[model samples]
Target chain A: IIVTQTMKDLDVQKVAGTWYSLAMAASDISLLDAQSAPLRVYVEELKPTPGGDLEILLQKWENGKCAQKKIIAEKTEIPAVFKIDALNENKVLVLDTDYKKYLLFCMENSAEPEQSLACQCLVRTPEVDDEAMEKFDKALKALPMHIRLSFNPTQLEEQCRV
Target chain B: VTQTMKDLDVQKVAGTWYSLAMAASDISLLDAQSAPLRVYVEELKPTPGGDLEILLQKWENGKCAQKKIIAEKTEIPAVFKIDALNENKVLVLDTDYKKYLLFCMENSAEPEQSLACQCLVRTPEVDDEAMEKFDKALKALPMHIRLSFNPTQLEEQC
Candidate 1:
């Protein structure tokens, strides 16, 4: 299940920040879903090495407090794409970003088609603009429909305190 | 007439906000070229002395500029006076986090006049709901205060 839709040019510096999951689609990997509203992925910091490898601190809220994982991402020949060593060397595609507002991502893996993944996120705000949401819907339409789902009434107040 | 709203949560107010309109006396205005000026109003992390820091960012002459001031809460909640510009009494008259209304007043001349003004901030979007609240809050300002939203630079989308 390789994701052929790869981002042409992704500036790592621009993509690093706190992103709130607005909508997501994961196959049999049930851990991630639209029910996970207010899900935040803080790309705390990214250190780029001369070998073109990136050390990234990905933080999230789990169980009741903040948790973090140090992951190494190797830049591929593709501009915005990287082979994330942490996720079994899965190829993570950087889709789109405005930096201030939202970011989109897709991950390619050698797993079965039912375990593929795609997700989109916005900045840590209670609400998103109409233009951003419209763009999100259009981009989501490009993904495999089998894994996609929409979660209305995004709940940010109760969970996300960014 | 000059009604002040209360119970403003500083945490909710700390974020990037779009300055939709502003009215002040003889002070520098927004970069006239930018369509709708965006302002970042952040509350700095608490210090050992307990004085609150408010950082404000805006555009000036085609470049982003920032101004900061230390403030102390007065007897009224959400009412603060900047240590540097203590003359202008500042008030958070209204806010739902989506939009906000800020009121400010300063006595300019002991023998003649006082300066009263207000500014409006909205999230990325300013829909009908936000507009209605803006108007209502504006009405609560003192009668002598003159309000203005730049007509030439009115946001097309708004």
Candidate 2:
């Protein structure tokens, strides 16, 4: 059961600022998937515009370096939905969130000839929050994903900027 | 959810079983409680059509749940086929009937290639021989053990 629910009455401004990629659940989780954008891209911060646009800052490990990335998220009529020009990522959706502690989002990617899904758990602090982990666990119990990834409670990288 | 070997006495392998430990190529699947593959074995039933029906209990969310998957016997004696979650090849690498049962499994290949190994015993309280057998066999696997766990104490709980 891969049920997805967008956050209701999403106030993007309240959800803005720095976040750490604590844990993830994805359809594919092999070492080979390290290069895949949907699996490795960690959300660093969210900057929402009043005009219904968003600046998404991301970080991911590529070729032994933590690469910084930026993408413009075009806001949809639905407050919780945003579209991207990315190939594998069709849209970025906010599944659940707490303004200060955690954010749970859903993104689907390509298995090339096939399609796959991913859920990311992002938190405000670098440290692991027991409550946020409980939220992540509860979310996964409700969804169907093949692999649960990362013991990286603090996905703090050396090369990427805050 | 399953695998088995050559000349495996399916009848002897039947009855009660306990999963003592597990190892996998992708360690992530072996860690989290939400792991889709964190299964606990209960019984092994040899079907009338020569397939092996695996009955197991698994912890989902916070409570224990049940599942049953059948492994169709291959042309080889102990090898079996599991087409449940896509293509799967299961080999009963070794089993002593009374002491221990070891399984070598491959869930998929290449793009989503995953290999998992399980050590099952007749009882939760394993002996020196049984423990050593599993340790030795687990290490002998061609696949790299990214992570391994021996703390799946299903017997102590519901």
Candidate 3:
């Protein structure tokens, strides 16, 4: 069983900015290992197109280099829920957030061998906030046990330079 | 006119491959592009009618994309014409499978200009001897076409 509920009346503007990955869960161990240096995802520059479509620059660090992809996240009637069609990733459920910190739920059905669902906690600051931790605990409990094992905490300020 | 080589083994060519270098007509554009981060792996299996079926896997946008194709042997030994959208014709220029390999292709849409492209691939580790072999293979191509290695597009690890 999975939680389909999303945060209501989510403000997309507040969520747009650089986010430090606090914790992540995924099927691929290499993906988690890559975060040993603290992986950062910058959701910089959002463009709100007609009918609620939002175009964004999604940049992430890999192999000590930054690679960026322009993604258009389609707005769903469900609020805070968007679909990035290019990657075949959907549902992009925003479970909890306070603008400064957030919890994102994504189901990767495109993976080979076995599909995986990931819950990532992101924050504006490197330090973990107590409020964010509480939200993460609730989100972790909502997931299945097998999925929970994939959870790994990333380095905070030590890894983030940009 | 583009000419393909002969006496190539299709079975030996089936496996994982890394992009080492490439030569193209648009040399300036190629230089401007980032390093290649992708690797291609193909599995050649026989179909019911004995035609070779090729399953190729490559990465796109950090995800694996699989494509299936059929190869029908031409009158030319070791040469194969791939049944694909682009009508790609492949020539197994050279290979040892263990160290290095060279492959050339002429896309269907660019046949008039003989717009051919070639790729040099090697294992993760390369020796000076293998490097010399790769250089010699690349030199065999036309002078107008420029070849580049250690492209910035490739990630340190995939």
Cα-based TM-score, every candidate: 0.39, 0.51, 0.40
By TM-score, rank the candidates, best first. 2, 3, 1
- Cα deviation at B114, candidate 3, in Å, is 60
**lDDT score for residue A58 of model 2:** 79
DockQ value of candidate 3: 0.01
| Candidate 1 per-residue C-alpha lDDT over A1-162 given as tens digits, one digit per residue, 9 for 90 to 100 | 333455556666665544455544443223232232232344444566666666766556666655776878788787667787444337666677676676666554645433445454454454545566556556655444223322223433333222
In model 1, which residue pairs have backbone atoms overlapping below 3 Å? none
How far does residue B40 in candidate 1 sit from its true spot (Å)?
48
For residues A1-162, write the lDDT of model 2, one tens digit per residue. 456778999888897788877666665434213344345667788898888777888776666677788878888899888877653576778888988999988666423312356777888887767687668767766554445554343234432321
What lDDT does the true structure give each of the candidates?
Answer: 0.48, 0.66, 0.50
| Residues B1-158 of candidate 3: C-alpha lDDT, one tens digit per residue | 33455565655555555555444432222222221312232345655543556554454455667767777777776566884534467666666766666655546667423333434444443344644554466445442223323323233323
Classified by CAPRI criteria, candidate 3 counts as incorrect
The residue ranges of model 1 lying beyond 4 angstroms of the native Cα positions read A1-4, A33-56, A60-62, A87-89, A124-126, A145-162, B1-158
Worst 10 residues of 2 chain A by lDDT: A153-162
Q: Please give the range of 10 consecutive residues that has the lowest summed lDDT in model 1 chain B.
A: B26-35
Please provide the root mean square deviation of candidate 1 (C-alpha atoms, Å): 19.5
Interface RMSD of each: 23.6, 8.6, 20.9
